[PDB]
Amino acid sequence: AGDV
Amino acid sequence: DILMTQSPSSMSVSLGDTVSITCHASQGISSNIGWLQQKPGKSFMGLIYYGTNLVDGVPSRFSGSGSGADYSLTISSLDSEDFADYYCVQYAQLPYTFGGGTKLEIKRADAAPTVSIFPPSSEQLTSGGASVVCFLNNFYPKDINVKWKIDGSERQNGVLNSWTDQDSKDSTYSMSSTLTLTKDEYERHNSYTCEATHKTSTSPIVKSFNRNEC
Amino acid sequence: LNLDPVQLTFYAGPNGSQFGFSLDFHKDSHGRVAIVVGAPRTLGPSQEETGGVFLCPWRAEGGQCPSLLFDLRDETRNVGSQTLQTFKARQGLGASVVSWSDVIVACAPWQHWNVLEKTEEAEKTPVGSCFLAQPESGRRAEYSPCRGNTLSRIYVENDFSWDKRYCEAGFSSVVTQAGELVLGAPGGYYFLGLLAQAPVADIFSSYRPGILLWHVSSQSLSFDSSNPEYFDGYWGYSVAVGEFDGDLNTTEYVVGAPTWSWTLGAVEILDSYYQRLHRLRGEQMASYFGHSVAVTDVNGDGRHDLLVGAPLYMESRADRKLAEVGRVYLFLQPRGPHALGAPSLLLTGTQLYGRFGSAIAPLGDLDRDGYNDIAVAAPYGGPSGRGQVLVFLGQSEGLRSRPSQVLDSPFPTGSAFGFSLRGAVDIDDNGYPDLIVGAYGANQVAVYRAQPVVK
Amino acid sequence: NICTTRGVSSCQQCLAVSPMCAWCSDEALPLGSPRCDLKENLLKDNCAPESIEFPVSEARVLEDRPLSDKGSGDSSQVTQVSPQRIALRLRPDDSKNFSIQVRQVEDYPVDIYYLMDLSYSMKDDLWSIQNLGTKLATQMRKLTSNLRIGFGAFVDKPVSPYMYISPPEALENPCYDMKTTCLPMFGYKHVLTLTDQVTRFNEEVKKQSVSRNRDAPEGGFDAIMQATVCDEKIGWRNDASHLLVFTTDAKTHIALDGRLAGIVQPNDGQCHVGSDNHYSASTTMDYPSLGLMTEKLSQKNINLIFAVTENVVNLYQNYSELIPGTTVGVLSMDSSNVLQLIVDAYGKIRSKVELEVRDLPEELSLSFNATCLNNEVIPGLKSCMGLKIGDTVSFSIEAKVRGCPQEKEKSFTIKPVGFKDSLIVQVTFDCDCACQAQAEPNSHRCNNGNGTFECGVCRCGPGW
Amino acid sequence: EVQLQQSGAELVKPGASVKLSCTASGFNIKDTYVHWVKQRPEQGLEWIGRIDPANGYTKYDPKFQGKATITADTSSNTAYLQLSSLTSEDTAVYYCVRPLYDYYAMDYWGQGTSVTVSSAKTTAPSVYPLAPVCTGSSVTLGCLVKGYFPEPVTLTWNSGSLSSGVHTFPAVLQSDLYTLSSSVTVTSSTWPSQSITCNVAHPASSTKVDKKIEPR
Ligand SMILES: *[C@@H]1O[C@H](CO)[C@@H](O[C@@H]2O[C@H](CO)[C@@H](O[C@@H]3O[C@H](CO[C@H]4O[C@H](CO)[C@@H](O)[C@H](O)[C@@H]4O)[C@@H](O)[C@H](O[C@H]4O[C@H](CO)[C@@H](O)[C@H](O)[C@@H]4O)[C@@H]3O)[C@H](O)[C@H]2NC(C)=O)[C@H](O)[C@H]1NC(C)=O
Ligand SMILES: *[C@@H]1O[C@H](CO)[C@@H](O[C@@H]2O[C@H](CO)[C@@H](O)[C@H](O)[C@H]2NC(C)=O)[C@H](O)[C@H]1NC(C)=O
Ligand SMILES: *[C@@H]1O[C@H](CO)[C@@H](O)[C@H](O)[C@H]1NC(C)=O
Ligand SMILES: [Ca+2]
Ligand SMILES: [Ca+2]
Ligand SMILES: [Ca+2]
Ligand SMILES: [Ca+2]
Ligand SMILES: [Mn+2]
Ligand SMILES: [Mn+2]
Ligand SMILES: [Mn+2]
């Protein structure tokens, strides 16, 4: 996912 | 799709020789090539991968080489087991494509074939059919041509041929031609013949027989 | 106690090369001890930072060292209708080095990798890579377990599962006595952190140059996870091995995760199948508990003990104020099948911002009293802030609460003296185990020889 | 009594016995009379009044400005501590008491720098700043008549693996692989210096758009450091409450995380924002530690505020405990009111008055009796809580000196945390007699030149 | 040791569907790619496609799109190849392949699975003795196994008594039925002196006929  | 032109299609050689199979591509593949071995009547075995690297367990006499779009598999000092089929395969692009193939055949002195013609059987004739068999056994090289003749005139429809792999302890080939006719058609003619053409004799070997006669 | 602080030996490397970022001893086939040093910012062929490795022979006067050469050229292979690419620029070759038998394993955690197929790509990411060498024979091999040929789109369709594109394999490393290389990859599985192991003998036999993507069937990587406690935990920031399950035919792994569970930090002991046997949680958030881990039996009961460093731990002081000084935790292994309880000893730093615990090196038995000893680095500790390495001696009850010897930095400010340690090896063959200390900030390594006890 | 039974030798030894001892330097004193006795006993033996040496511990004020009612206006001539300076005098093993008053002044200037996460994840959280400038002053205008606001933005360290570095178009547009477009990646950029023109805030905000990085943790701590140590750039005011609002919807990178980018250099705590208003050490210097951040926030007197979404409120509530003075607020869509948060946080900030002592000698030891609420005394306490702007508290203080020090002149400070003003205490250790100034070295009375005559008695001269 | 056990030979009718299997032994199928290769005597070797058993993604040669469908089950550690709408051209031996080290190589091969497509029902052979014509130093007899299905058949002379000096030729297919022949050579003093018998067996029909070679 990360930067979400 | 990359085309793999493998050559030669076959070669007759002896033990201890040093032979080199080649393989030409339609474009550059940058050593993205492998070499395979298929012993007669068996599965495949990997030899080389990425042009030159040997597969684990492969003798060191095998060796690959080449670059760009031309590569070569070399076998130093042939062995009895090395007589088999060999194929090149590229994986530089999907779909993977294989070469034509190369069959390593044992070499020996030439030999003419022992022709033998056989008229139909009583059982087969009473069944409503007629099949003439012509055995061409033990000859070398493999290149041979058979020709059937009814009353001297050539016949080509209804002929089934079958060759044998190079025999083990004599290194000769054999062949079986079978002309098949109906009972009615077989009796329309009297003479039957199968002519063999081998490099041994300039004149073709002939063996015939006549129906209603012995 | 008995490390000679007067007559040191100094090795050195190019300026700005960070010579001494990582080091380790190395015995050749004939047992001749040398020192392998990693310089992760050495200049390459294109005058660009790629890193480098040096193999320093033992000389009481030190000096310059010869290079252990590795291929620094970027690679490209067009195969399977794809294009494989390696980018060694700023890869950091030498950011970790370790020795086993007559083999050296130097790693470039930030080597980048990318695969191109028409207009798509796998993304240019730091998978990391390790370079293996047998100096005497000249044999070379590589090991990059996180390289893949999957395109970017596929990862999106699968919700970024088993994403090994940012592994940074080689960030930390260790090798078992049996010969099983174990690499830490704190970026694997989208910054969860993974481990990767494989026999050294299999890395060499299965490697060929130009393949870039090859299989090592005997390898074994760890597993992804859906647990948020492992998110952004950097599992594999530090790695070690030991024996913590009684069974001697098995080798247990120790993994550091300094940001596990929302920067709480944790260390986990595992078996060779990556099954967790125990977990040690951090004490304070952002203390980076797990930055460094060490395994050595300090109380002489034959059972390996564990040491964990939290270099950014903030000690509680008067008037409700905290002070970053660092801390080290000692865990003594109990008898038979039992869990490692609370720490037996808490060693806390003293110098503000000193980072006490940034490195912990087993020294072996330094004073030869029967108990093994350790060294703890405070790369910015001491009254000057130039660095400090404190020695703590072993006792039946664990470790001494006070240091027996303090090595002040012979280098200028900003040398990071103690950022890398290594001991428990007698390099001069005087029967005492010696200590090598790195200082990449000064591009130098300092060797401290152990001498007979004066007292 | 103890003054006599001790059998002292000099006026100096006498006063050291007890604060209640006195010394009679009279010549015409009875032979058997002890010179070291109570002031009452000495006068009873016809000792000359001027010959009595009896210091008394006192404590008179020097500066006693009145506590200001309104912090507005003025050239920062506001007084919120009273008294501001006092002269303290003590004698050996004695102790004197004094008091101090602190006031949370009304209508004190306020600076509010807004540090805004602009990572891609902050798309669904941009709703909170759209028109913040106008609505923020309206509510603040009631509390303070002199507000200034500024804006800064951050994402993460623009370096792999935090940053998408492929394809080449991904550097100019991190959202290339997607259908949309976004700004290039940046670590920290100053946008709007602290100004009283609120419309400059909303118009600067309206021009802001998000960027995009790879990993969920964001380099917001780099921005907290620069927003603290770059005084002239951000524009903090010397006499104003400093509020630093940190807004994010994700986890944060911490010290020693930079090593995943190759960054090992510790944070130096210095300002590295130049004319281009960007943070230049982003790609070469590691993130700052919680200890370093605390050092600069206390140095620059900044009050940090974590205005985060509820999915990380527990995280930044735990960090808030490791950074004293910090406060947290929930950046949801349901509460008292979002970014009235800032108002509630400002009230939470000025609801405490904790005293702090600086430069206290080793000999002195202080004790405090707090008076919070309405004359409710609380022994052994130097901090108040639950206060409102405008309230006033007081503390009684007692300094207990231990012995007499070498240096007779020292001074320490008592300051409330975060406050500008302070109480300066000038201590004077009176453990000497005035008769010691008129001593007769090598006097004829003392062993024929081999002694010194002072305060009536004969002291053995130097060298003996 | 790596080994790929493929399923046994298949015999089906045109228009039907068959599903070959490739079980992995000594390792995990999930390790590497798994390719499928078709082999014919005249056409030669042809690459069908590949699969990644870890994720299931596949690639096919456009010549086999629709006809071939490769799948894999990590649980059974086996990979499969399904061929729908079979025809005569689908009569070929199919191998499953995997690389050794190089991700994209073709090194290890299964034994191969033979597939025959034909509507021909089980048919017993019609053995016919082949005697010469009404002389030389050595004579040559023969036997003719005609019209049978499916393969194979074991031909022997005098119940395996006569082994050397014999040439049994490969079988040939015509009209959806196989045909085979076998020769034999001896001296003139061996025949018709010593009785010679052709012994053929067709396990499929469970028939074993013997025919003694009679002169003319
Ligand atoms: C922010 O900071 C807070 C404050 O520390 C953290 O809160 C704690 O989280 C830990 C771990 O999740 C909790 O740990 C456990 O305590 C349990 C007992 O708790 C009781 O008592 C407290 C007292 O206030 C109550 O609040 C609580 O509701 C319980 O009634 C134990 O049962 C747990 O034990 C088991 O798990 C541990 C693993 O940690 C094993 O080692 C044990 O053997 C056992 O199997 C555990 O010890 C802790 O209770 C929490 N405290 C509070 C006050 O909430 C937040 O997690 C942290 N969050 C972030 C994002 O940073
Ligand atoms: C803080 O409060 C304590 C208790 O209320 C004070 O202690 C008393 O001072 C009186 C002064 O007459 C003495 O009679 C008591 O004996 C003291 N109490 C004790 C327990 O000794 C103390 O003085 C106060 N301190 C300040 C600075 O206000
Ligand atoms: C000191 O204490 C006494 C009572 O204990 C009080 O009257 C006085 O005001 C206090 N403070 C001074 C004298 O500054
Ligand atoms: Ca074990
Ligand atoms: Ca132990
Ligand atoms: Ca010891
Ligand atoms: Ca030594
Ligand atoms: Mn974000
Ligand atoms: Mn969001
Ligand atoms: Mn981030």
Author numbering:
A (entry chain G): 408 to 411
B (entry chain L): 1 to 214
C (entry chain A): 1 to 455
D (entry chain B): 3 to 466
E (entry chain H): 1 to 134, 138 to 219
Study authors write:
Integrins are heterodimeric adhesion receptors that transmit outside-in as well as inside-out signals across the cell membrane. Ligands of αI-less integrins such as αIIbβ3 bind to a groove located in the interface between the α- and β-subunits. When activated, the ectodomain of αIIbβ3 undergoes large-scale structural reshaping to an extended conformation with an open headpiece and binds with high affinity to the two distal ends of a fibrinogen dimer, causing platelets to form tight aggregates. Within fibrinogen, αIIbβ3 binds not to RGD, but to a 400HHLGGAKQAGDV411 sequence at the C terminus of the γ subunit.
